[PDB]
Amino acid sequence: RFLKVKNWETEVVLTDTLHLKSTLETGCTEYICMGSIMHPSATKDQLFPLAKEFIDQYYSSIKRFGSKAHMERLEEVNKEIDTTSTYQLKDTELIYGAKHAWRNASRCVGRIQWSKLQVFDARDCTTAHGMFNYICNHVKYATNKGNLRSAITIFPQRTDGKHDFRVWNSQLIRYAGYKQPDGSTLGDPANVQFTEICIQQGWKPPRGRFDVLPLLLQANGNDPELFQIPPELVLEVPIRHPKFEWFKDLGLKWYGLPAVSNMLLEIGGLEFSACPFSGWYMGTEIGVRDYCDNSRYNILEEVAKKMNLDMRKTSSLWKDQALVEINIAVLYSFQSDKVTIVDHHSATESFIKHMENEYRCRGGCPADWVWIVPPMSGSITPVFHQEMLNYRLTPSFEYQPDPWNTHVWK
Amino acid sequence: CPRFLKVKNWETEVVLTDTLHLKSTLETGCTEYICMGSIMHPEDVATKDQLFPLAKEFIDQYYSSIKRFGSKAHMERLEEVNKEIDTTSTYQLKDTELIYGAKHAWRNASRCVGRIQWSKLQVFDARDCTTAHGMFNYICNHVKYATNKGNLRSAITIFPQRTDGKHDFRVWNSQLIRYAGYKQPDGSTLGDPANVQFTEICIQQGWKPPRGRFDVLPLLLQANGNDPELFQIPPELVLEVPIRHPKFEWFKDLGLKWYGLPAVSNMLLEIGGLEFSACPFSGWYMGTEIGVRDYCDNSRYNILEEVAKKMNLDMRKTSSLWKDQALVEINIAVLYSFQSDKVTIVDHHSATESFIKHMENEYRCRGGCPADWVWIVPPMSGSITPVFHQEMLNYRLTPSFEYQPDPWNTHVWK
Numbered sequence: 001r002f003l004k005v006k007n008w009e010t011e012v013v014l015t016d017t018l019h020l021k022s023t024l025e026t027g028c029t030e031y032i033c034m035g036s037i038m039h040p041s042a043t044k045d046q047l048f049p050l051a052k053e054f055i056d057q058y059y060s061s062i063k064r065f066g067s068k069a070h071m072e073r074l075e076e077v078n079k080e081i082d083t084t085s086t087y088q089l090k091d092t093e094l095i096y097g098a099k100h101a102w103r104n105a106s107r108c109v110g111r112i113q114w115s116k117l118q119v120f121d122a123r124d125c126t127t128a129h130g131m132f133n134y135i136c137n138h139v140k141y142a143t144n145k146g147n148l149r150s151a152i153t154i155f156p157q158r159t160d161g162k163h164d165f166r167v168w169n170s171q172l173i174r175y176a177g178y179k180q181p182d183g184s185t186l187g188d189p190a191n192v193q194f195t196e197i198c199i200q201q202g203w204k205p206p207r208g209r210f211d212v213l214p215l216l217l218q219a220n221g222n223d224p225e226l227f228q229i230p231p232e233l234v235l236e237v238p239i240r241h242p243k244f245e246w247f248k249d250l251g252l253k254w255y256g257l258p259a260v261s262n263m264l265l266e267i268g269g270l271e272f273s274a275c276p277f278s279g280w281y282m283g284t285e286i287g288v289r290d291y292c293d294n295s296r297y298n299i300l301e302e303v304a305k306k307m308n309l310d311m312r313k314t315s316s317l318w319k320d321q322a323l324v325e326i327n328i329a330v331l332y333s334f335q336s337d338k339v340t341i342v343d344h345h346s347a348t349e350s351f352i353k354h355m356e357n358e359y360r361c362r363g364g365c366p367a368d369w370v371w372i373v374p375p376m377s378g379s380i381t382p383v384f385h386q387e388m389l390n391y392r393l394t395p396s397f398e399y400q401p402d403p404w405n406t407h408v409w410k
Numbered sequence: 411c412p413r414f415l416k417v418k419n420w421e422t423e424v425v426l427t428d429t430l431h432l433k434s435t436l437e438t439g440c441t442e443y444i445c446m447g448s449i450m451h452p453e454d455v456a457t458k459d460q461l462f463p464l465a466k467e468f469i470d471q472y473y474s475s476i477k478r479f480g481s482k483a484h485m486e487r488l489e490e491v492n493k494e495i496d497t498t499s500t501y502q503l504k505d506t507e508l509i510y511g512a513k514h515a516w517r518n519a520s521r522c523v524g525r526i527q528w529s530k531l532q533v534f535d536a537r538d539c540t541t542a543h544g545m546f547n548y549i550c551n552h553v554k555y556a557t558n559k560g561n562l563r564s565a566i567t568i569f570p571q572r573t574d575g576k577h578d579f580r581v582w583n584s585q586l587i588r589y590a591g592y593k594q595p596d597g598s599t600l601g602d603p604a605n606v607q608f609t610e611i612c613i614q615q616g617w618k619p620p621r622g623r624f625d626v627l628p629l630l631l632q633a634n635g636n637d638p639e640l641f642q643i644p645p646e647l648v649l650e651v652p653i654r655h656p657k658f659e660w661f662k663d664l665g666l667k668w669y670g671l672p673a674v675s676n677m678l679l680e681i682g683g684l685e686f687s688a689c690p691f692s693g694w695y696m697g698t699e700i701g702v703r704d705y706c707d708n709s710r711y712n713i714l715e716e717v718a719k720k721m722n723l724d725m726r727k728t729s730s731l732w733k734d735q736a737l738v739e740i741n742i743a744v745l746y747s748f749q750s751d752k753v754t755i756v757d758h759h760s761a762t763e764s765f766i767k768h769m770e771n772e773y774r775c776r777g778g779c780p781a782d783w784v785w786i787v788p789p790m791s792g793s794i795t796p797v798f799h800q801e802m803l804n805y806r807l808t809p810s811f812e813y814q815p816d817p818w819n820t821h822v823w824k
């Protein structure tokens with residue numbers, strides 16, 4: 001039945017009806033909540049009710065539920081699953097399904113933008129060279145000389161499971177990481193294993209601190225192939241600080257385009273194992289997690305040193321002070337280079353506004369508090385104080401296994 | 411439900427295995443279709459038939475902990491409790507069982523980051539209390555013991571259990587020590603805006619308010635279901651800390667201070683199906699409870715603007731992060747002021763590091779540790795603490811602390 005969510009700062013109460021339409025599991029039970037677990041836990045027979053569900057909500061979104069167009073589409077889809085064990089989405093259904101997978105992404109604070117999404121149909125692709133051409137067009141389009149535009153590129157759906165299209169990179173643009181003889185790590189420590197697979201596949205590493213990784217692209221289940229993104233397509237930002245002139249001497253930079261390439265798009269029971277999507281950054285993604293996680297670039301110690309902070313005891317909050325300055329620098333840098341970025345105060349503001357929109361016009365908004373609240377300054381943002389209900393609506397983005405754990409090579 | 415559930419720490423790769431969840435008793439509020447993990451709160455009294463298995467379960471657990479399960483004393487205690495429920499519809503805990511039950515309610519409190527301390531809890535048995543004056547004496551003794559001139563000691567005082575629901579003992583205060591808040595005709599608030607409703611109840615009950623920014627509220631104490639009564643805590647028992655900053659000399663000019671003892675007094679303690687509706691317990695603060703929530707919440711003291719002004723910060727763009735910068739300095743001042751005055755406080759880095767060590771020990775020796783990530787992660791600098799990266803399982807073990815309705819909403823006035 002109906003569920004209420006309260007904001008404890010503004011005392012606004014919203015009423016959720018939309019959760020009655022979910023079916024996929026959350027991972028919780030009545031006795032155990034798994035809200036902080038990151039990853040909890042086809043045939044003709046399973047496929048038709050899923051397709052029927054999706055076709056039903058599409059024709060209901062365009063105000064033609066039960067129409068003649070609706071009926072023939074259900075019939076069309078029915079006979080296609082019969083003869084081929086799958087079916088193909090219309091262009092309009094593809095675009096609607098991709099926008100709603102974003103709209104339904106409970107962990108995304110950026111969803112106020114959900115309906116401004118440029119959808120690139122790449123379902124005619126057959127080879128890794130074709131994938132690379134499609135991916136370059138995406139990157140060029142989404143980057144737009146710093147005026148970033150949300151986009152998704154959708155490669156052919158899964159068939160028998162042995163001819164998957166996959167982007168092996170977890171993101172389209174990432175820096176390499178290198179295991180050093182002495183024990184430490186040059187570059188990004190999260191990408192050490194992927195970097196090794198690229199080297200093992202023939203990539204010549206410059207062994208620097210910000211080496212853009214090549215694309216490793218698998219088409220139709222074949223061995224993946226390496227490709228270099230042309231450098232003029234990779235927009236980067238040197239990180240400097242408005243007051244600390246020594247900050248540029250740290251030599252830090254980052255790329256402007258965040259582009260997730262390892263997730264699975266599910267629409268009406270069809271599985272798109274390669275659907276790279278991109279938006280623009282929230283400042284904390286770079287300044288808190290990328291630079292200050294102990295298992296990432298891990299620069300807090302250096303910054304606090306140049307800040308001459310007393311680092312002998314934790315209760316001086318030297319880590320918290322250094323962390324704010326780093327995030328000031330990131331926002332100042334992207335803004336000075338006219339590269340789209342949002343700070344966590346503005347992003348969480350917009351998300352509360354989005355939530356209000358969705359409850360009014362849709363009857364709810366699935367939202368994952370554990371991911372929505374920013375990784376710094378939590379309670380001075382409005383989402384800290386916002387109760388949220390998490391539930392799984394489809395179309396959706398899902399996690400899938402890494403391809404180097406399942407691919408049987410030549 | 412499967413026998414083993416795994417949790418991973420994503421910073422360190424450590425994987426832990428939980429079997430304790432199989433003893434889960436009540437409901438989280440979640441279902442397999444919806445998660446309510448960020449919902450703050452997701453007369454009846456227990457009958458004889460509900461009480462028997464709840465008492466057996468607790469007694470069984472107690473005799474297991476002292477390595478006397480199935481023993482003669484175990485079976486005799488079971489037998490004596492069963493008779494008591496039969497004749498009187500209730501039973502009385504032994505002092506040993508009361509102490510065990512209180513410590514385990516803390517140990518089981520999924521929202522508490524301070525639980526590494528759970529076995530060092532001083533339990534004060536106040537079940538012989540009969541009047542509000544006697545409750546005041548017990549609470550004063552609690553405050554003085556727990557404060558200990560600044561070397562704070564965790565403690566709980568347990569008043570008589572519920573009987574028929576018409577004779578409840580209650581502390582109407584939500585915490586033993588809070589500052590008053592006063593709504594002004596022009597809509598502004600003086601003092602702590604969170605406490606305006608309770609403050610008005612006190613004034614109606616006869617309190618003469620000084621109408622200051624930091625006035626300690628009186629105790630409002632209900633014994634045996636009678637109308638509650640007002641008492642002033644002796645001010646020498648209320649340890650307070652003036653807030654100053656190690657670098658900003660102007661920070662003392664803001665006139666901020668805070669009390670040293672966090673003491674929750676509106677929760678209900680449940681042990682073996684018995685309900686202790688008045689059980690004030692106290693610990694010591696984590697700095698962010700004061701520095702981030704009390705001072706910087708918009709609907710609390712809300713000083714970020716005034717601090718940012720004196721820090722000469724650009725306050726027109728949010729992307730200058732002027733709020734974040736000032737929040738850090740306020741939390742530096744709070745930790746510096748408590749440490750300088752030798753009042754126990756713990757920073758959020760140290761407290762979350764201890765909690766990870768504690769949770770690992772509990773997984774190792776107890777088979778799990780219920781934890782509520784939404785509450786355990788501090789309200790600032792979340793991801794630079796080790797709990798941010800820690801997967802957690804949340805579930806309800808008993809003995810437990812529970813929320814209960816506010817007493818002014820249910821009390822039948824004599």
Ligand code: HEM
Nearest residue numbers: 102105107108109110113150151277278279280281282397
């Ligand atoms: C347009 C600007 C966008 C912003 C500012 C934004 C912001 C964010 C942030 C901060 C996260 C948390 C990511 C993390 O901590 O690793 C996130 C997650 C996510 N975003 Fe958005 N996002 C944007 C666009 C998009 C788009 C275009 C899509 C898909 C079409 C999308 C789908 C998702 C999904 C599925 C997640 C969850 C990823 C996971 O579970 O690992 N986002 N977003």
Ligand code: HEM
Nearest residue numbers: 516519521522523524527564565691692693694695696811
């Ligand atoms: C000894 C040092 C202690 C520390 C550092 C500590 C720390 C904390 C913190 C930071 C919270 C979150 C509070 C909030 O955000 O409002 C909390 C909650 C809690 N603590 Fe502890 N605590 C301590 C002692 C205790 C003791 C002695 C008990 C009970 C015997 C206890 C039981 C609880 C409970 C039940 C909650 C949940 C309160 C609620 O849901 O509103 N804590 N603790």
Ligand SMILES: Cc1cc(N)nc(CCc2cc(F)cc(CC[C@@H]3CCCN3C)c2)c1
Nearest residue numbers: 171173174258259260277278279280281282
């Ligand atoms: C569309 C979009 C917009 C945005 N603004 N942001 C994102 C996530 C960005 C991102 C960039 C990377 F280069 C790497 C990762 C992986 C992060 C991993 C996944 C789970 C744990 N860890 C956080 C995410 C996506």
Ligand SMILES: Cc1cc(N)nc(CCc2cc(F)cc(CC[C@@H]3CCCN3C)c2)c1
Nearest residue numbers: 585588672673674691692693694695696699
């Ligand atoms: C034993 C103990 C130790 C500690 N270190 N801390 C606490 C919580 C302290 C506290 C002090 C207050 F003055 C008010 C509250 C209640 C705050 C309310 C409850 C729910 C929303 N809000 C946070 C708790 C308890």
Ligand SMILES: C[C@H](O)[C@H](O)[C@H]1CNc2nc(N)[nH]c(=O)c2N1
Nearest residue numbers: 384385386387448449450784785
């Ligand atoms: C909506 C959300 O559940 C609420 O703001 C919670 C979030 N986490 C919290 N965590 C702690 N420790 N204390 C709190 O009061 C809250 N408030």
Ligand SMILES: C[C@H](O)[C@H](O)[C@H]1CNc2nc(N)[nH]c(=O)c2N1
Nearest residue numbers: 036037038370371798799800801
């Ligand atoms: C254990 C926990 O689920 C994990 O650290 C989550 C917490 N919240 C997060 N929130 C965001 N936005 N991104 C993350 O990677 C995480 N990590």
Ligand SMILES: [Zn+2]
Nearest residue numbers: 028033440445
């Ligand atoms: Zn849950």
